[PDB]
Amino acid sequence: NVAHGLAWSYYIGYLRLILPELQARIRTYNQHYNNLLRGAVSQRLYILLPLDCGVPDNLSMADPNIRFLDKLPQQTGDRAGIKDRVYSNSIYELLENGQRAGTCVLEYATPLQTLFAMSQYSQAGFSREDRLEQAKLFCRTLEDILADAPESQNNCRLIAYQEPADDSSFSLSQEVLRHLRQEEKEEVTV
Amino acid sequence: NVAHGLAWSYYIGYLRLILPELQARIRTYNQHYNNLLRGAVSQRLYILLPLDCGVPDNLSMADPNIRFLDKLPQQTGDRAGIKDRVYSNSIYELLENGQRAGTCVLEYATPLQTLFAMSQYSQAGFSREDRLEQAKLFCRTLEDILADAPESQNNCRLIAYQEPSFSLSQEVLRHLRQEEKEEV
Numbered sequence: 569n570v571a572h573g574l575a576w577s578y579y580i581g582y583l584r585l586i587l588p589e590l591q592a593r594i595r596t597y598n599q600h601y602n603n604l605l606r607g608a609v610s611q612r613l614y615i616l617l618p619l620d621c622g623v624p625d626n627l628s629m630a631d632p633n634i635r636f637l638d639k640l641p642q643q644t645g646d647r648a649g650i651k652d653r654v655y656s657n658s659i660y661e662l663l664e665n666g667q668r669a670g671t672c673v674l675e676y677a678t679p680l681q682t683l684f685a686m687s688q689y690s691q692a693g694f695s696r697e698d699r700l701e702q703a704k705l706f707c708r709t710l711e712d713i714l715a716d717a718p719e720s721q722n723n724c725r726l727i728a729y730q731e732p733a734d735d736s737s738f739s740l741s742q743e744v745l746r747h748l749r750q751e752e753k754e755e756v757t758v
Numbered sequence: 759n760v761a762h763g764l765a766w767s768y769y770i771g772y773l774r775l776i777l778p779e780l781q782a783r784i785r786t787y788n789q790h791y792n793n794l795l796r797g798a799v800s801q802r803l804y805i806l807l808p809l810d811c812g813v814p815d816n817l818s819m820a821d822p823n824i825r826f827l828d829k830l831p832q833q834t835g836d837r838a839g840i841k842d843r844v845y846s847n848s849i850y851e852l853l854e855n856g857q858r859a860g861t862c863v864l865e866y867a868t869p870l871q872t873l874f875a876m877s878q879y880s881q882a883g884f885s886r887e888d889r890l891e892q893a894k895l896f897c898r899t900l901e902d903i904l905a906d907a908p909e910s911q912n913n914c915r916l917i918a919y920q921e922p923s924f925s926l927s928q929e930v931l932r933h934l935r936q937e938e939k940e941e942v
């Protein structure tokens with residue numbers, strides 16, 4: 569299917585390359601920038617999966633309480649004939665009542681944006697249900713790929729949610745903070 | 759259906775973004791390096807499409823007569839939550855016994871690597887015959903998209919080939935020479 573190929577594209581063309589190198593870049597960032605990403609919770613790549621496929625290019629537009637802080641050091645690699653193709657990731661603070669409640673490396677899964685854009689060219693389903701369904705198959709396929717990639721998969725976390733892009737009562741920052749707090753609770757020995 | 763998604767992603771996420779800006783970047787390069795990307799033939803983006811989907815990452819190690827020259831100035835954009843995602847392209851000289859026989863911005867169609875990998879990972883359920891068929895469908899889908907694009911998105915040449923006495927540099931040079939003839 570379409571989402572099946574896009575999930576393999578997302579792993580083969582991105583996650584396979586950047587997940588093994590992520591901790592080294594975070595360690596380099598923390599050494600030179602006063603250890604902003606503290607603890608395992610703040611050291612994963614958090615991948616946003618809006619199953620609505622509404623994907624803004626600026627996260628601050630999706631929620632004012634998500635604010636850009638810095639970039640990790642870039643990763644370069646020779647890729648399909650391009651010398652030093654650049655892979656870059658952005659660090660955000662999550663604000664709660666005007667105060668920083670979290671810090672994480674955060675981004676959208678770009679292929680969900682591709683699915684939506686494809687519908688704009690009348691080459692993929694465009695309806696609310698069709699966006700949700702195509703995104704679900706992509707997410708489940710990506711989940712299965714990562715479960716079969718035990719060597720590098722623990723460097724990322726998937727954050728999927730169904731609320732519409734234009735839903736004004738939905739807090740993306742609160743959605744991320746809920747995941748981060750749950751991750752920290754799993755660290756307690758009980 | 760795999761190829762349909764990959765080809766549209768290649769257009770939506772790459773070609774539609776960089777082709778309208780490619781001439782300006784080449785012009786910037788040509789202004790500081792003595793119109794070395796000369797003639798209309800050196801102004802296009804050349805995209806290698808090996809139909810078996812075997813895509814080396816290093817072009818100079820694939821054929822020593824394909825020699826890295828320079829990066830174009832890079833192009834950046836905010837993309838899906840990433841600030842200043844970087845788009846970069848490489849210029850190469852094609853040599854014959856030391857003589858420059860052509861110069862161009864040259865690369866492989868990266869999504870062919872996804873088709874190849876799916877044919878090697880048993881979890882993907884994707885055979886070599888599937889790979890070869892989707893590779894042809896990817897090429898045809900991309901050709902259709904580019905044919906429907908504005909003249910601002912049209913400045914690229916797809917070089918599709920089957921490798922059976924094979925020179926990759928000669929494969930490119932044959933297309934560059936044909937274009938030079940259709941100029942005059």
Ligand SMILES: Nc1nc(=O)c2ncn([C@@H]3C[C@@H]4COP(=O)(O)O[C@H]5[C@@H](F)[C@H](n6cnc7c(N)ncnc76)O[C@@H]5COP(=O)(O)O[C@H]4C3)c2[nH]1
Binds near residue numbers: 579580769846
């Ligand atoms: N966050 C994030 N940062 C990244 O740096 C990144 N790189 C990959 N990916 C993800 C894996 C998908 C497939 O990656 P890939 O196998 O390279 O296929 C590309 C390639 F053929 C071409 N292309 C695009 N950009 C470029 C470029 N700079 N240079 C050359 N060619 C370029 O367009 C296709 C579709 O790209 P898209 O962004 O839509 O989907 C990406 C999303 C990324 N994600």
